[PDB]
Amino acid sequence: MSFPKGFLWGAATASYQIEGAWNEDGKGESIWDRFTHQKGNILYGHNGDIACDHYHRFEEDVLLMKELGLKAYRFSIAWTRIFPDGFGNVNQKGLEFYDRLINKLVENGIEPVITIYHWDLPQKLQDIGGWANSEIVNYYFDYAMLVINRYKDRVKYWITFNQPYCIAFLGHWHGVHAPGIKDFKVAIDVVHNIMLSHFKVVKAVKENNIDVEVGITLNLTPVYLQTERLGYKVSEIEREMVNLSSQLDNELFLDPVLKGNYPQKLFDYLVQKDLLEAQKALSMQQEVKENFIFPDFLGINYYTRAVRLYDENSSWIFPIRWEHPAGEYTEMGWEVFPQGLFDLLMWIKENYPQIPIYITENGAAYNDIVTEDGKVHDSKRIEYLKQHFDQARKAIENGVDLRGYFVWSLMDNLEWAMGYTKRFGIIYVDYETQKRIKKDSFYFYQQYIKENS
Ligand SMILES: OC[C@H]1O[C@@H](O)[C@H](O)[C@@H](O)[C@@H]1O
Secondary structure, eight states: OOOOTTOEEEEEOOHHHHOOOTTSTTOOOBHHHHHHTSTTSSGGGOOSSSTTOHHHHHHHHHHHHHHHTOSEEEEEOOHHHHOTTSSSSOOHHHHHHHHHHHHHHHHTTOEEEEEEESSOOBHHHHTTTGGGSTTHHHHHHHHHHHHHHHHTTTOOEEEEEEOHHIIIIIHHTSOSSTTOOOOHHHHHHHHHHHHHHHHHHHHHHHHTTOOOEEEEEEEOOOEEEHHHHHTOOOOHHHHHHHHHHHHHHTHHHHHHHHHSSOOHHHHHHHHHTTSSOHHHHHHHHHHHHHHOOOOSEEEEEOOOOEEEEEOTTOSSSSSEEEEOOSSOBOTTSOBOOTHHHHHHHHHHHHHSOOOOEEEEEEOOOOOOOOOTTSOOOOHHHHHHHHHHHHHHHHHHHTTOOEEEEEEEOSSOOOOGGGGGGOOOOSEEEETTTTEEEEOHHHHHHHHHHHTTO
16 A cells, blocks of 8 residues: 655754754844743753754755655744744845745755744744734734745645644643743633634635645644553543543644634533633634634644543543553653554544645654764664554555655754753754764655655
């Protein structure tokens, strides 16, 4: 069973994680510039001031992509490089960088896939409440339409948002991501404003007859029951409560994007527990129904699963706990579970309308060391990729409309609050010299693309 003709074998990055040049050429301050410049937020006080210096070295990086034989390259645009203040003055030097990057990609036969928002909100917009302020929808819209209109001739695939779960909950509930806010109700407001922002862009692309594909990227976590792993009888309350908990991860974002409503079971529970105001629940349902429009593709970020069970006295917002099955784990503490990719894809196929699917991120963090001969023998990363590739092939064989696969990541980069301590690249980056070293996984992926295209 072969991968389809034209399958987009890719690699992915995000602007804040690789670009550096955080205050060059009139670039405004982002919430991640602010967050990493405050003590106690990032391991080892790492920041994205320099990162992989991709802003200056993009030409050499594109050459590595060509050598690799990528069909596509997924990256994000830094809003603050285009509108330093979020709205108003457009920065010509910002636009010129992405002009040069995109042209270089096109010259090398690589399909650009652009994430419009990958977490780096302008701090000036955060100053007025960021994603919690419904004015953000229009500011985002103007930014998105500017870049789409400028690049639509060279860029066919656009992703409105990457991982709304993180933007909302990690950014505004747990506060482990920028902007570091800790309020569940604010986080739900953010979810809603993201959905409206997304819908507005999809609508404008259709209504203005812009010939591009617009999607959104969600991290999805397939949830499994510890009780079933153990062979016990599953109680009704357990199944119900674990289902609720997994709706927070998955359905809360899939349902509005693909069906035009929020999951009602989740909302009923959140209102009952005074985690969501009854009025807001009704308004959110109505506004999403009014503005809903089906997208052109679904982007899925997949890394691992979760195993859960009922626990009446848990400190989580649902009475559930997590369990840790035996097996292999990455430096992130994430279970290596390729089967979860297959189960997830089949579950999307069976429970949602037909839609093309791209795996916009999948990869693994291992503690790479460079040998004396200047190599990186990341055989565990290779095994991780090989097994997930195989599950993707199996999903295709079972009728999933999978159209691409982007490895996270093209190169080692700043892993947000974990700093540079987590290496996901198929290319090693020595942060002292900015040298790029092709890992063994680079050559494995190169070969894999060659024999599956
Ligand atoms: O946490 C590892 C990776 O998770 C993904 O879901 C995010 O989109 C990436 O930006 C991040 O580097």
